[PDB]
């Protein structure tokens, strides 16, 4: 029931549309207005769209929601462009836990990570195909030998 | 070339003067030849007395690769920290030397106290002993002392000390030489690229 609800699979279609049933399933009833995703839809691009909305609808009051959601959008865009680097899914999961209930000032972000955590839970393979490049945030400064962390 | 007259240490006669020899009243070609001969013998016969202090003495012995008496020495190299308990000793040894005498300060400590601005250290030997050449470094490379000796030779070849203690002016005229820093400013500033600190 909404863009801020956790995705469920075909197995959860036999669950009654009640607040307790969907909650135990691992999501929320929300507005009870469900949306169906077909096999021709990529989960990474779908969640990227969801995050782009949740990220720009932020009011900018608390850091977790104001600076954390924009990070996820960039990771998801990199994954859908095949430019993902190792550690991206872990950051996404850490964001989902640290933008959860209680951490943010209101429930915009707690509900914004609900679709993301679910997509990684049931369709991780789609998020993994994105990581195709080695991790690198540093260029090579000439004259300075780099600290080779192993 | 201007000269500094030390007629007859922290406070003493230091009048800036003109080449006493060039002055016509005391201008004699023979006297000039005599001055040059004495300066030549002194600059080419600088016997040293290395007062070993702290770690600089170790670099000095590497350069060495002896006037054990201050009496036979013409140069006292202060190489080390001027500790409070050592300062009286340094002054006594320098005061047991005969004219002409020179002093080269080797090391940041002997130069100004260096990294040891502490209660037990004199901030520079130039606080009690007149110095002629200062060698920056900690410790200064053995080759740096050799450069200092060559700089002293040049300064000694331009001095106008009394030719005899019974006649003439008994004044030590030391030339106001050009600072080495300004002399080699051009080449230093021209430097553009250097080897990356990545290779041996
Ligand atoms: S979680 Fe709520 S209060 Fe915090 S930035 Fe988002 S909209 Fe603003
Ligand atoms: S200047 Fe440096 S190396 Fe030389 S004696 Fe002092 S501390 Fe030691």
PDB file of N, CA and C in Angstrom, chain A residues 142-145, chain B residues 196-199:
ATOM      1  N   UNK A 142      51.431  11.960  -7.440  1.00  0.00           N
ATOM      2  CA  UNK A 142      52.848  11.648  -7.776  1.00  0.00           C
ATOM      3  C   UNK A 142      53.773  12.208  -6.694  1.00  0.00           C
ATOM      4  N   UNK A 143      54.723  11.398  -6.222  1.00  0.00           N
ATOM      5  CA  UNK A 143      55.644  11.828  -5.154  1.00  0.00           C
ATOM      6  C   UNK A 143      55.253  11.220  -3.823  1.00  0.00           C
ATOM      7  N   UNK A 144      54.000  10.784  -3.696  1.00  0.00           N
ATOM      8  CA  UNK A 144      53.507  10.195  -2.414  1.00  0.00           C
ATOM      9  C   UNK A 144      53.164   8.719  -2.653  1.00  0.00           C
ATOM     10  N   UNK A 145      53.928   7.803  -2.054  1.00  0.00           N
ATOM     11  CA  UNK A 145      53.623   6.356  -2.177  1.00  0.00           C
ATOM     12  C   UNK A 145      52.351   6.072  -1.365  1.00  0.00           C
TER      13      UNK A 145
ATOM     14  N   UNK B 196      61.252  12.813  -7.326  1.00  0.00           N
ATOM     15  CA  UNK B 196      60.110  12.487  -6.447  1.00  0.00           C
ATOM     16  C   UNK B 196      60.612  11.701  -5.256  1.00  0.00           C
ATOM     17  N   UNK B 197      60.092  11.952  -4.035  1.00  0.00           N
ATOM     18  CA  UNK B 197      60.498  11.188  -2.866  1.00  0.00           C
ATOM     19  C   UNK B 197      59.868   9.810  -2.918  1.00  0.00           C
ATOM     20  N   UNK B 198      60.241   9.015  -3.921  1.00  0.00           N
ATOM     21  CA  UNK B 198      59.627   7.676  -4.117  1.00  0.00           C
ATOM     22  C   UNK B 198      60.747   6.668  -4.379  1.00  0.00           C
ATOM     23  N   UNK B 199      61.888   7.146  -4.879  1.00  0.00           N
ATOM     24  CA  UNK B 199      63.003   6.235  -5.237  1.00  0.00           C
ATOM     25  C   UNK B 199      64.149   6.387  -4.231  1.00  0.00           C
TER      26      UNK B 199
END
